[PDB]
Structure 1
Amino acid sequence: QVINTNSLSLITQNNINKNQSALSSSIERLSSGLRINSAKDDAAGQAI
């Protein structure tokens, strides 16, 4: 019945934070127009 920890909320926040990166990547790709917009993406594709 514990209210000093609401672990369900922690799981939900973890999932939202996980989705955040994908959402940001999708927006960045849509705005820029290039799938390799940084070295973190491929960087072998970036070098070539």
Structure 2
Amino acid sequence: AQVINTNSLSLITQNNINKNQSALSSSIERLSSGLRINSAKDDAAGQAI
């Protein structure tokens, strides 16, 4: 290898997984909850209606 001070590829991998973790959490919490809005974290325009 060339760089040993930092494993930049590992940083890219972690950055990629962090985004997918949010989608996983949102999917699980929306599946558990009956309501689609799930506590107004989404757009509130339909939430008020």
Q: TM-score over 0.5 for the alignment?
A: yes
Identity of matched residues, % = 100
Gaps of at least 5 residues in structure 1 are none
Gaps of at least 5 residues in structure 2 are none
Encode CA deviations 1:3-42: one digit per residue, 9 max, x unaligned: 1110100000001000011000000011012110122212
User: Please, what TM-score do these two structures have when normalized by structure 2?
Assistant: 0.86
The aligned length equals 48
CA RMSD of aligned residues (A): 0.9
